[PDB]
């Protein structure tokens with residue numbers, strides 16, 4: 001991989017289903033067009049300053065996983081255990097639930113033209129996408145990657161149609177929605193903070209950039225150069241798509257809209273308006289099919305330290321797929337969509353993710369006072385992880401002191417419930433602990449035909 | 459004027475505001491069946507019904523002078539006392555009248571909410587006086603409207 | 608100033624579109640009100656308009672006398688209750704909600 | 708004997724038994740059938756749901772004579788700017804549609820409206 005083809009993996013991973021779902025709730029919190037475009041630019045700065053901090057840790061430590069070896073080197077085994085627990089039950093199944101709910105908003109919306117589709121059709125079509133993707137990825141290890149090339153191709157076709165059609169209509173003089181852009185706004189730290197949650201969901205994927213892009217012709221120069229080029233190129237596409245929405249829509253019509261891209265495609269492309277619910281739905285299950293490939297990489301290394309059940313990250317003998325980890329992610333994702341509601345799963349995902357984004361970036365500053373003699377090839381200026389830590393404190397504390405809703409309580413009570421399991425199964429190796437786990441490991445092994453992966457660390 | 463009627467609880471503006479709020483928040487009023495009864499020199503009585511929703515609205519409007527009404531002789535299966543949902547005299551909101559004798563002043567209108575499963579458009583004696591546009595039934599377990607009646 | 612069978616023709620045919628509804632002013636033409644006279648206006652519209660069409664109702668307008676001067680002040684509240692409990696679209700002339 | 712972490716060859720002497728072959732097989736075909744039930748129940752509800760109401764069927768209409776509604780520039784005549792300043796009153800009446808009568812540039816403002824220019828507003 002060169003430099004130019006290193007940009008292609010960064011852009012193709014970050015651009016997903018977020019730009020088709022998030023513009024309604026960024027505008028709903030900052031109720032003007034002017035501050036709505038400031039937020040979509042400021043999340044592009046947080047995503048590039050966050051990915052530069054992860055690029056330093058990824059060449060410093062050189063152990064696979066996610067944030068798990070970065071948290072173990074800085075604090076010890078307690079926040080490393082809490083990351084593998086909170087990514088097992090909170091972070092990874094809610095990501096799979098938001099995407100499959102985003103697929104169902106776009107399949108159902110052209111059949112309800114001036115109307116709102118009922119929640120039972122949105123949820124029972126999103127549940128059929130979770131079960132179908134979990135069945136395909138648990139049987140056909142090579143089939144998920146062949147169709148991924150035509151899902152990436154359908155994704156950046158509909159992105160280029162929206163960006164170009166917005167520049168043509170803006171040239172003809174359709175600029176009357178940007179006239180008094182800063183009248184009617186919120187300087188509230190609960191409304192600004194929730195516009196950052198939904199804006200940073202569309203930028204999600206900047207922290208998984210470390211591992212699959214170490215295969216470059218000259219790392220330690222081409223990796224930090226792929227972040228300064230790759231993610232501000234995504235920020236240029238996200239601002240241009242939101243400008244393209246406000247040329248055909250008022251800020252009031254965008255709030256009263258089920259799917260924001262089927263409303264755009266009804267005013268611009270009339271005799272072929274069905275290509276927007278067709279390509280966005282292909283782009284969305286391509287984003288859900290991609291996450292089931294790496295299911296088990298963090299599970300395996302956390303099980304090696306004894307911080308995770310080892311019956312997960314077993315491999316089926318026929319159809320060499322990580323079938324226990326894929327089936328477990330599908331069960332928690334169908335449980336999350338029954339209370340459901342995108343704008344409640346986005347706040348639930350973003351509170352847990354940015355609690356641990358700010359712990360590894362603070363761990364970068366801890367490892368400069370505690371962990372010298374450590375051979376840093378990439379080295380950031382020290383003010384970049386300082387402000388990225390303080391912004392992560394703002395994204396955690398401000399929702400619970402301004403607009404405390406009930407999903408922020410279930411997210412705390414599920415993370416700290418893992419803190420009890422640390423003191424009963426890791427810290428105090430009780431005798432009745434492995435009297436339970438290996439009976440479950442042995443019987444699930446014969447039920448699914450799954451073996452230990454014929455694989456050591458590397 | 460508008461300003462003095464915003465601060466009067468028995469004004470014409472207040473009755474207009476919660477009649478249009480009730481019309482916006484009730485599927486029986488904006489979408490339901492319309493089933494009128496027999497003619498009368500004094501009053502007009504009709505119902506608003508919808509299949510799957512197991513309550514009805516009973517509208518009683520006196521257009522003559524002061525009269526007394528026996529609603530038992532017009533609708534079968536009513537209780538001995540009915541609660542008023544809305545009245546042209548808004549002091550009578552939530553009050554209970556007795557079904558056998560309902561006293562109506564000149565120009566008095568009442569809306570009753572009655573829990574029942576006896577819809578008039580299903581009976582063959584009232585089907586010729588029942589009307590709909592955009593016919594649908596309501597599913598209370600799924601919270602949807604459906605057309606397969 | 609038209610017959611009900613000619614007014615209903617503006618609804619069109621099931622295979623030919625026309626007006627969404629013709630405006631119904633038959634309640635505005637009642638100079639005195641009664642139980643039999645309100646009944647015959649309501650049943651004339653519902654029986655004559657085609658099946659599955661949308662009705663509408665008016666009680667006044669710019670060419671009609673205002674309702675508290677046409678019928679009296681005792682009928683303001685009950686004519687508003689009639690307008691919002693009948694099927695279809697209620698149409699309100701300005702000032703009727705106050706009783707001008 | 709199965710212990711906890713069996714290889715490929717110890718597992719095959721026990722995974723083919725009847726107490727592990729039929730609970731694996733019915734749990735696979737109840738998931739594939741649940742994909743086809745949740746898909747057919749989606750096409751059942753979409754094809755059976757009624758076409759919902761247009762905006763002109765949903766809420767009440769409010770008819771305004773524009774010369775008599777609200778005067779904003781102190782000339783004794785109601786204007787279109789005076790209607791814009793009273794839109795909070797109209798939304799508090801739970802009104803869906805505003806019906807404005809004729810405001811075209813006219814020589815005759817009664818008797819069914821003799822209009823001079825169908826594409827201009829009258830200056831009053």
Ligand SMILES: CCCCCCCCCCCCCCCCCC(=O)OC[C@H](COP(=O)(O)O)OC(=O)CCCCCCCCCCCCCCCCC
Pocket residue numbers: 134135136138139318319323327331335440447448449730731732734735738
């Ligand atoms: C209400 C809140 C709680 C809800 C909980 C719901 C739980 C529902 C579980 C449903 C499981 C569905 C599994 C089928 C998924 C098929 C996906 C697929 O394509 O498979 C390919 C895969 C390919 O196999 P092949 O066809 O043999 O090649 O098929 C299977 O492996 C099917 C095996 C079924 C696996 C069932 C696993 C169930 C684990 C339950 C263990 C519970 C232990 C608890 C002990 C507690 C002790 C305290």
Ligand SMILES: CCCCCCCCCCCCCCCCCC(=O)OC[C@H](COP(=O)(O)O)OC(=O)CCCCCCCCCCCCCCCCC
Pocket residue numbers: 089306307308309310311312323324325327328332335421425426432433434436437438440441444
């Ligand atoms: C195929 C999908 C299912 C397979 C995976 C689940 C297996 C079924 C058993 C479920 C758990 C049964 C009780 C725990 C048994 C192990 C206890 C123990 O002693 O650990 C030793 C264990 C080591 O065991 P070893 O792997 O044998 O060495 O120590 C730990 O791993 C500590 C970490 C425990 C992590 C617990 C994970 C629990 C997953 C289920 C969470 C349920 C809530 C989901 C979210 C709420 C709904 C939204």
Ligand SMILES: *[C@@H]1O[C@H](CO)[C@@H](O[C@@H]2O[C@H](CO)[C@@H](O)[C@H](O)[C@H]2NC(C)=O)[C@H](O)[C@H]1NC(C)=O
Pocket residue numbers: 461462
């Ligand atoms: C109608 O006008 C009267 C008098 O102009 C207002 O009544 C009171 O006026 C005195 C001044 O003489 C004020 O001190 C009082 O506060 C007024 N009363 C109230 C209740 O405001 C009255 O406000 C006007 N408006 C109405 C009746 O809606």
Ligand SMILES: *[C@@H]1O[C@H](CO)[C@@H](O[C@@H]2O[C@H](CO)[C@@H](O)[C@H](O)[C@H]2NC(C)=O)[C@H](O)[C@H]1NC(C)=O
Pocket residue numbers: 497498499643
């Ligand atoms: C209800 O309507 C019927 C029929 O329209 C009325 O019955 C007769 O109607 C004719 C002409 O419409 C009159 O000449 C008769 O005098 C009416 N008969 C009686 C006994 O009144 C009937 O009056 C109406 N009103 C009711 C039943 O209250």
Ligand SMILES: NC(=[NH2+])NCCC[C@H](N)C(=O)O
Pocket residue numbers: 013014015016017018019095201202203204205208287291
């Ligand atoms: N690991 C993941 N796939 N996370 C979700 C990525 C979401 C993606 N950035 C989007 O625009 O929707």
